[PDB]
């Protein structure tokens with residue numbers, strides 16, 4: 001005789017040993033436990049191998065050999081006097097003026113530059129500073145998913161502050177209030193637990209090895225609020241920027257646009273309106289933060305890693321849920337390990353203006369980690385289902401025929417792309433989940449929900465009772481891993497390579513009051529940017545510029561959403577679902593024929609939604625299925 005072997009119980013026991021949760025002492029939300037976040041402490045198959053290797057060896061190479069070496073060289077360089085290696089007679093930060101920097105930038109456009117825009121950045125447009133091209137980023141930039149209808153209380157607040165400054169023209173627009181949109185970063189204070197008297201400051205220290213020399217520099221951030229009007233023709237126009245929101249507008253400092261329609265022209269040109277150009281640069285730091293922390297890192301990288309852990313712990317390999325979800329995980333785990341190790345500490349905490357210091361010792365007391373922590377807690381899995389997302393933020397893509405969202409290619413593209421995926425999920429899911437009863441009698445789904453709700457710390461994940469709830473939930477997992485991440489990741493090089501367009505943080509403190517702001521000149525906007533060889537600003541530009549170069553490297557064809565729709569070949573797991581005779585392989589091949597046929601179709605509609613934008617608007621080519629990654633693999 002022997003010991004009785006339970007195949008499933010044995011498998012899920014070995015998984016709960018390999019895929020353990022982190023305990024939260026490292027300062028991050030719940031993730032895969034990896035001692036010191038080292039490569040060799042990962043599951044054998046989830047760690048990087050040489051390129052061109054058998055999938056068994058590993059996941060190949062996540063980042064560019066040479067690009068990683070550079071970013072590390074930079075983040076390690078901790079003396080304020082730039083190394084001899086990096087030093088050049090001509091660099092993109094040297095300046096000293098904006099003009100000099102803009103001139104260098106355009107010389108560096110080719111003809112690597114191996115992103116989807118091929119080395120072009122928003123600097124190609126001579127009016128990158130403009131209200132049109134600023135405001136458009138909230139719809140077609142790197143963070144197009146946060147913009148929202150203003151509450152009646154935020155409108156009534158700006159009516160009060162406008163009538164206090166004595167601008168009856170703006171008061172009228174807001175008091176009527178047709179299509180008043182908001183971009184609210186005021187939550188940054190409550191997320192870090194900073195009071196309204198306190199101000200965001202990252203004191204960077206100069207080091208010789210480990211020993212600090214007493215010399216420091218400072219980067220500053222702001223809890224900015226931006227109020228827009230969306231016009232009937234589809235153009236988004238910014239009306240007012242609050243620099244740093246502190247409880248009420250009375251206590252904050254709020255500049256209004258001198259141009260109240262996008263067609264307006266004033267005696268002070270946009271290019272020469274330094275008070276407004278500054279106010280825009282401040283809010284471009286607030287969006288940089290919300291993007292790299294909330295929208296990019298939390299709401300895709302870390303939420304998906306929780307799904308990967310919970311699913312590996314609860315649902316056995318060869319189960320249908322495992323075979324539809326697992327393709328969308330390739331490289332994600334080893335990627336996030338490198339992020340917790342190198343990118344968030346060395347780079348994000350360094351170049352952001354939350355602080356309190358760089359370097360740090362305890363990251364638990366570091367406001368960038370308090371923000372990551374807060375964004376993860378305040379994520380809502382069901383409210384970020386595209387149909388729910390759009391309805392909640394006040395965008396009726398479905399029902400509007402006025403061409404008012406013509407310049408919102410994200411919302412147009414996703415509303416379609418969501419349905420295409422959900423259509424593929426429904427057809428495969430209903431292949432075995434024939435009623436609410438089969439879901440309720442399922443061994444793993446109730447425990448899978450509970451695992452993610454509790455251990456994963458995503459209480460907003462549904463208690464799956466019905467086939468509709470299961471389908472939306474599997475969809476949200478694939479949406480998050482593939483298109484939603486592709487959207488917010490693959491345009492980074494374009495909107496960040498030209499730092500002054502969207503800088504990580506300010507290099508000078510905010511003005512004392514509105515009077516001081518109103519007297520701002522070019523010298524004040526140039527001082528606030530990482531321009532010059534002084535104050536270790538070389539480091540701030542090089543990181544701001546090379547981190548996007550590192551992350552924006554264009555997905556190889558094999559790791560595409562459309563190559564999977566074609567073959568259903570799971571790169572991650574090195575098997576194909578329709579070679580598993582257990583499942584209805586005739587239905588799944590049909591679901592994939594339709595999926596692949598829907599993605600070819602969708603590519604033409606995405607192209608058309610980009611071309612349908614207001615003349616001269618920047619293209620939105622990011623959700624092209626050929627350019628959409630199967631998974632969060634960079």
Ligand SMILES: [Fe+2]
Pocket residue numbers: 296301485489551632634
């Ligand atoms: Fe990413």
